[PDB]
Amino acid sequence: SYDSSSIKVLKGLDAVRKRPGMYIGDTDDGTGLHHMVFEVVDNAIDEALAGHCKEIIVTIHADNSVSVQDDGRGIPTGIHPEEGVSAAEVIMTVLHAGGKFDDNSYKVSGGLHGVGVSVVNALSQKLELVIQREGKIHRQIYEHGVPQAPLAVTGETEKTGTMVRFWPSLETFTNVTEFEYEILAKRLRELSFLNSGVSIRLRDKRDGKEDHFHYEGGIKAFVEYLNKNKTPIHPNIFYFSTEKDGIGVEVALQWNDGFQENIYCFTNNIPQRDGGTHLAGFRAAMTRTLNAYMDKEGYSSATGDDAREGLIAVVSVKVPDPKFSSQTKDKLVSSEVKSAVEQQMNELLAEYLLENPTDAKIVVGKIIDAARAREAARRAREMT
């Protein structure tokens, strides 16, 4: 019988355990598992974006838990008047709850849904929260998202910060159940390039391995690092950072003598593996600007794909309220970011080409060469 009794409302964090795919992604291949860490790291990076955190420590513990310590402002501890429990507990236990729904606590933040750490909490067999704030140390333990006692003061400190340690639930995660140093290291290295002046440490207590990421030079250096085992064909990396019409657009790029295209897109320091409106705007401006230059200089027909070949590019945007298609934020679905990136690229790339004639002539040569190889491949196919 299909009737009112058949309709069920999931409460608290039950929806997260029931439908983990829409909150954490794939619970079998390891991507969801490492995403648990990235949610916690993203919250610390948001304190760094806000100007309050200068050191982040990620530790893989020997019992297969992970901790993230930050020296930010600390998760608020006072009783939330509407909810009747510490703000920290609200945050850990309530979906669509947080401090990122306006721009008062974080001007710009990767976080926006009020969901991330509460998902981590929901899918962890245990979670330990330690908060240093207003002279005091606060502690609380959760099991499968259920707080064991209310947040309590345990001592004094001159410091501020948040430490979250979590033990993932094997009732949720299957197959890849251990953390992979290199997966975490890739992301943290990236975050160092994206956050100059923030010390990011990674420690593996299983084997004693550690890294300290504090790169100089931001996304321009990131482009160098990425071309390190390749052969750049021109010496001057194109770079700019602007803030126009409420949107930050930062781009670095350089061509190498290979044939792959590697464009890394980020929104508020969160990578979009599946691209989005920022990537679309970058592509459109690149195609237009190179075409105009080749027309004006009398080198002209090469398409957007020919420009792509040998390209390494980083596109980092800063947006007050971006729009992602999912909690995992693999794709940016914000049309106004396409226009901002496209506009800034069109203006500044055209200027780069004019100020750097040697590089410009090399890049044109490369585009023409890619076009020549494409047409030869096509002729060869047709003839078989």
Next chain:
Amino acid sequence: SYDSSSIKVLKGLDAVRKRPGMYIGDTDDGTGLHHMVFEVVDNAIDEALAGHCKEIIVTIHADNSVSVQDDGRGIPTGIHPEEGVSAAEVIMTVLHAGGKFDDNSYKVSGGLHGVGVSVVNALSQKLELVIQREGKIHRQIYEHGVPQAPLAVTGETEKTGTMVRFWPSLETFTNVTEFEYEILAKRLRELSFLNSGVSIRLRDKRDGKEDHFHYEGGIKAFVEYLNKNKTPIHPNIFYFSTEKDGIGVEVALQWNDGFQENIYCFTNNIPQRDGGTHLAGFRAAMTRTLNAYMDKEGYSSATGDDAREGLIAVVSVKVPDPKFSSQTKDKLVSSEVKSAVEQQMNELLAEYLLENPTDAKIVVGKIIDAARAREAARRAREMT
């Protein structure tokens, strides 16, 4: 000051309006807008999967609203004891609320999150709900997700069904704000192929256009339709439907003399544009099975990509609890579906090749040809 007062909990449907990207996708390019219709249609298709709905009517109204009428069981109308309002209102107003969290009301359903129609309601300036059930007509109106009065009985009927008409909010949707007949028609045509015996009608009150989709022949016919303006190279479409280990796997495919690959994947009748574990399993089985056949018959080196060229395939799986990465369900993230598709394909495709030697020899020829064209393209590139 960042403190407990800075932490906000979004209630009811406020989170949906605040962060529409994670619920509906892109609110500017039209995809989110049409997805509003698809959520409502999916709920009717679920009544059809359950065996209770035989006719679905989709109408685009002249005032830019859309209605979906189904002749299913009807959304439950009785007071929900826990929530204190009609089950219908719970459904329309509460996230993670519905009848698809077990398999008692729907054995198999595209719906699983308890979110879809409540998102439609949240992002509509107005929504009209009419429910025919247990001898009675029930009606309710919402504005921006707020019910105007409680669900009320308005008359009598011998029929059963649900009608939802919604007017999308222009406070959410921008730029593409009108419905496109062809976008709806593509999906409904697909759904007719996927649901043999279900009459699906589409009517546009703006211009009088209509369609009635009731295709014979299921996904095998779907493959024909897709190859209609192309040139199939072998006459016998490979087809099977099995249900093993709790999973339905249904596949049809055929090669044409073109060079594109078009694999259409579905889970509980919902398309995955971004593929997933079903697509991964299909690819893996195809590659293995063709290779083994070419080895055994002495035709052997061609890769998975060469097999892909000229392929049209439909892969339709039926799963008790699938896992998607998002509310829009663009990607299936369920590892056990990869194994089920891979296993069934390996067994049944090998049998197809043995029972259809003429087709098998043609397909081998095509693979070898694709391989030859690929190597010639590569040589041609290298030489420029």
